[PDB]
Design a protein around this ligand. Structure first.
Ligand code: RK2
Length: 333
């Protein structure tokens, strides 16, 4: 056997138990196959980790975090994909999951990137904030570290229930091992700036994800780290001095002046790309496509806009935390 991937043959049966149906996924971690578990009589998704020591080490962390989670009593743990069991087979670690449906990016593609309704956006946001409240449980303190539409799956194609997958980049608070993390579009300023991070980076990612779900377009579509930070500054302005003063990578993006103030190195002027206009609050919503529509009033959009700007706080110490996000007027019945 050569290369890092397992040789998968559709039709084969593993350990007189799993009937392999099809290769349904391929990522940097390895592969995902659909299999029929003859013993429990159900479809499962088997995540097959590459036989490369770095990947096996990180997948053992994923297993430990998923077993810590799936054992907590609360009904909140059901927003996290269920790890059924794991086993070694042909020198690969294999993680067995419940079979889920397609991811929120596929849902955007299905709308021809016009976005989903503010009402469906709100349902996704409530479940996501509840999942993040669960991860923030003191005995867990799990940072997902790779929230993106691709890592949020529908349970069922005809329903709005979601779960979070892929804890392959995850760590617990105080066990940071990667200086470079998060998918670029959803990467928090503290990570771009090479600072130590905490659970607040997942709330940043969530703010980005919810705007994209409603507009159909990434809020911050950087081609690279410098473009990413410049796109963030277009919307939010120059980060606070107290943060840049302790940021290892401040000078990758910004320059300190005699005055002790920071500006950009070497785009719209800072803070002039208003979320007000990105969302089309007063001009019929994204691309004007929601004009008049029920559920899409200026009052609705101003509540949504307010919660997003609390999620996109530059300061990880004052960025809105999940419990408080769930108390926001955006969610009030
Ligand atoms: C349909 C389905 N049910 C699933 C159940 C579990 C998982 C899954 C995938 C990964 N990376 N990490 C965990 N912890 C669980 N993925 C499922 N998928 C999507 C697979 C096909 O692709 C995907 C989906 C997401 C990411 C990569 N590839």
């Amino acid at each position: 056997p050569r290369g890092s991937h397992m040789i998968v043959k559709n039709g084969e049966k593993w350990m007189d138990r799993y009937e392999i149906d099809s290769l349904i996924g391929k990522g940097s971690f390895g592969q995902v196959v659909k299999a029929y578990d003859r013993v429990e009589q159900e479809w499962v998704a088997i995540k097959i980790i590459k036989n490369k020591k770095a990947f096996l080490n990180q997948a053992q962390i994923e297993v430990r975090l998923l077993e810590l989670m799936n054992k907590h009593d609360t009904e909140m743990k059901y927003y996290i994909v269920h790890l059924k069991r794991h086993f070694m087979f042909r020198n690969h670690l294999c993680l067995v999951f419940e079979m889920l449906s397609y991811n929120l990016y596929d849902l955007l593609r299905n709308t021809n990137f016009r976005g989903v309704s503010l009402n469906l956006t709100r349902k996704f946001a409530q479940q996501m904030c509840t999942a993040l409240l669960f991860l923030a449980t003191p005995e867990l303190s799990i940072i997902h570290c790779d929230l993106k539409p691709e890592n949020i799956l529908l349970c069922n194609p005809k329903r709005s229930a979601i779960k979070i997958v892929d804890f392959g980049s995850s760590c617990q608070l105080g066990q940071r091992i990667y200086q470079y993390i998060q998918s670029r579009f959803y990467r928090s300023p503290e990570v771009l700036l090479g600072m130590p991070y905490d659970l607040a980076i997942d709330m940043w990612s969530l703010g980005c994800i919810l705007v994209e779900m409603h507009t159909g377009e990434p809020l911050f579509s950087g081609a690279n780290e410098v473009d990413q930070m410049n796109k963030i500054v277009e919307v939010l302005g120059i980060p606070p001095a107290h943060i840049l003063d302790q940021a290892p990578k401040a000078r990758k993006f910004f320059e300190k002046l005699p005055d002790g103030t920071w500006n950009l190195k070497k785009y719209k002027p800072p803070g002039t790309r208003k979320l007000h206009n990105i969302l089309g609050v007063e001009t019929g919503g994204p691309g004007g496509r929601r004009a008049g529509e029920s559920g899409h009033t200026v009052a609705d959009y101003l509540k949504f806009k307010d919660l997003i700007l609390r999620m996109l706080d530059y300061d990880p110490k004052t960025r809105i935390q999940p419990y408080y996000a769930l108390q926001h007027s955006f969610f009030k019945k």
